[PDB]
Every structure is written in structure tokens, then in C-alpha cells.
Design a protein around this nucleic acid. Structure first.
Ligand code: QN8
Ligand code: QN8
Ligand code: QN8
Ligand code: QN8
Ligand code: QNN
Ligand code: QNN
Ligand code: ZN
Ligand code: ZN
Lengths: 190, 190
DNA sequence: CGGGCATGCC
DNA sequence: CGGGCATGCC
């Protein structure tokens, strides 16, 4: 009945974890600082191999309680101003994948983007998905300065939740500057 | 052949001049500082009475040479987020008038808004048009921090130019602050 | 690149 | 209200 997706970490029976200029990641804040329309690799780590047909879904949610029930969408300006697959209303794109699906949920109206889970090749320890955020956090008529989380869910082909992780995202012009400011504020005022 | 409207002051044979918290006007800068979607009265002054059927047209133009040939439009966000007469692409509206016309020029693509010239009633010395700017100067995908001029033209019913005046506009959140900053910068660095 | 400005907002 | 913050940009 809820149209608000869960954000609670569930690393699950497969031991699902995420792994991480243009962008910088803060472990202390569990927060990515990146620039708009520049791809950000996110690593998928598992302790046990997921079943064939496992899928990886990404969905944004507003972090603040007062905004959590509002669907995160691309702002009207960047909707108007395009890879031929992503609907222009979607904030999060996946690059570098031939089986990307974009979902507009018919009941919750939430956007998500899904790709097949590919196990690491023999010799490799993780797999990478190239995400792209098509607005700044500040975009008027879109995120409008409200922080988001990206929720990454590992799902089997039947729809079962296998694992869930999330990280906060700030899409901004100056990731290094803004990261330093936020880490300093955490230490001084958090 | 030109699609760039003239901005040169032409007070003309009728002695046409303009006359002038929510907003403040700087004579030194010939510049209105106002807030978005809040009406701004502009006074029309004439030395001689224009003929019956005279019209008053308002049109925005970018002030900077590198932007002058781009049509000034409402940004996509405020286009989407409405008095039932103004097309949502138009930046400048007129309130308080029953004969407002909105023009999208079929050749130049420029927007303008026109009302009848009404002579001041017996006892009055000027007439007022209530303009409304539907974006901030800063709006992404619209003016995008580029200053505009508003060009007010007094035209007879045949289309003859009777007079022309202009003023710069900054639509902003804090007109009083921004006016003081710009006047100070004129004195210190102009 | 990075310090400072420009500007909606707290 | 007004000083200060938040943030794309110079
Ligand atoms: C944005 C940065 C990078 O360069 C890679 C991918 C995402 N983060 C962490 C590692
Ligand atoms: C995490 C994995 C690896 O083991 C190497 C380096 C980064 N990714 C892809 C290959
Ligand atoms: C914005 C201010 C006002 O209060 C009136 C109309 C426009 N300016 C000058 C006078
Ligand atoms: C300029 C005119 C006048 O003479 C009075 C005061 C302001 N407007 C309208 C009436
Ligand atoms: C802050 C941001 C900028 O404004 C440029 C480009 C990348 N960052 C440093 C210099
Ligand atoms: C600057 C602007 C604001 O932020 C509020 C409203 C009007 N001005 C003063 C206080
Ligand atoms: Zn945007
Ligand atoms: Zn706007």
C-alpha cells in the first residue's frame, strides 16, 4: 500500500555491498558528490553469487522527512534540454549497458532504472554500473536543493528482494569544495 | 529584415516618457529591481495627446551584445508552474487590463504584450500599466542571469512608431539589497 | 584550479 | 527584516 520505497540497508544472504575533480565519495557521510551528466561508477560487491537473472535497480528518494513522499524527477529545464532510451523525466540514467530498462511505476509513479546483474569475470572481484545524474541537486523545479538518496536493490528475476543499499547524493558544480564544507560542518556542528 | 528590435530611446513628437520591499527603481542605472510575479506599475507620460487607437507594447530584449539576438522567454519551470490569457512562454504579463493582447511574432519569434493607450482622466497627469515579470533574471533555462531591457513602444493603430523608451530590469529575490550593491559598484568600479 | 562573486533562501 | 548561508559560476 505504501508508495514510499524502503531505504533501510539490507545486505542480505548474498552479502551485498556497494563500493566507491568530477566526483568524490565520503565514507563518513555515506555520500557521493558528483557533477551533472558525468558518469559515476558504482561497484557491486557480493559474498555469494546471486542466481541467474538477478537484476540491479536504482531509484532516488528525497532524504528529508517532509519530502519523502514526493517523486524525485528531472527538472523541466533538463527535461527539455538524450540517449534515445532514457525518458526525459528520469533523473538517473545508466550508461554502458545494452539491457537498460526504465520504469515509471503505474501505481507509485516512482522512476527507476534496471540492468542485469553480471557476476564479475573470472579474476575480478566486483562489477561496476555507470550511473549518470541528469540534474544538479539545486535544480529549480526538480530536486530544488533537497538531498536525495540513491537506493540500489539487488532483485531476483521473480521480484524477491535479495539485498538493498543506499547512499546520499549531492550533484553539484564543485564536488571537492562541497565535500570539504560538509565534512567540516559534520565535525564542527554535527 | 532585422529580427532584433530597436532599443534606442525615441521620445518623439508626443514627448513620451516613462515614470516610476517588492521593488525599487534606480534613476542612475535606469533600472527596475523587482520580484517575480509581483505587479510593477509603469507610468506613461506624454506632452501631447496621442491619437485615438494608440497602443502600448512591451517587449524584453537581452542587454548584452552576445545575447541580443536570442528571444527572451519564460523558463521551462515557470512555463509549467496562469491567468488564462497569457501564453505560458511569455515572460511579461499585463494585469488590470481587459484588452491585453499577447503576440508571438510569426517572423522574429519575439514575444510582446500590448494594451490600448488610455489618456489620463480629467485631473490626472499620467497613466499606469501594471506589468508582471514571471521569472527571476537568474532562472535556469530562461534569462539565466542575463540582464534584460524592457522596451515600451507607443504605436498608433496603423503601426507607426510614435515613441520608444526602455529600462533595464533585474527580477530578483532581494531588490533592495541588489540595488544597493549595483549602485555601490557603479560608484566604486564603473 | 581556486579564490571570490552572484543570488535564492534561511 | 537583515545578516549569513548555499551554490552555480567567473
Ligand atoms: C565518483 C568517484 C570515482 O572516480 C569512482 C566512481 C564513483 N566515485 C568513487 C570511485
Ligand atoms: C572491483 C573490481 C575488480 O576486482 C577489478 C578492479 C575494480 N573492479 C573491476 C576489476
Ligand atoms: C516598483 C516600484 C513602485 O512601487 C511603483 C511602480 C514601480 N516602481 C516605481 C513606482
Ligand atoms: C501620474 C498620475 C497622476 O497624476 C495621479 C498620480 C499618479 N498617476 C495617476 C493619478
Ligand atoms: C568549482 C568548480 C568550478 O567552478 C571549476 C570547475 C570544477 N570546480 C573547480 C573549478
Ligand atoms: C532578501 C529578501 C528575503 O530573503 C526576505 C524577503 C525580502 N527580502 C528581505 C527578506
Ligand atoms: Zn535540472
Ligand atoms: Zn523562471
Amino acid at each position: 500500500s505504501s508508495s514510499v520505497p524502503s531505504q533501510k540497508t539490507y545486505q542480505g544472504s548474498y552479502g551485498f555491498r556497494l563500493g566507491f575533480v568530477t566526483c568524490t565519495y565520503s565514507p563518513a557521510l555515506n555520500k557521493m558528490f558528483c557533477q551533472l551528466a558525468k558518469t559515476c561508477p558504482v561497484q557491486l560487491w557480493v559474498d555469494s553469487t546471486p542466481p541467474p537473472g538477478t537484476r540491479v535497480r536504482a531509484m532516488a528518494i528525497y532524504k528529508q522527512s517532509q519530502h519523502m513522499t514526493e517523486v524525485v524527477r528531472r527538472c523541466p529545464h533538463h527535461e527539455r534540454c538524450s540517449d534515445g532510451l532514457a525518458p526525459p523525466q528520469h533523473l538517473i540514467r545508466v550508461e554502458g549497458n545494452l539491457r537498460v530498462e526504465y520504469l515509471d511505476d503505474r501505481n507509485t509513479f516512482r522512476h527507476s532504472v534496471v540492468v542485469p546483474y553480471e557476476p564479475p569475470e573470472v579474476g575480478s572481484d566486483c562489477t561496476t554500473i555507470h550511473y549518470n545524474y541528469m540534474c544538479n541537486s539545486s535544480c529549480m523545479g526538480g530536486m530544488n536543493r533537497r538531498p536525495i538518496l540513491t537506493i540500489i536493490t539487488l532483485e531476483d528475476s521473480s521480484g524477491n528482494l535479495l539485498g538493498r543499499n543506499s547512499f546520499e547524493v549531492r550533484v553539484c558544480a564543485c564536488p571537492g569544495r562541497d565535500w570539504r564544507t560538509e565534512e567540516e560542518n559534520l565535525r564542527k556542528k554535527g
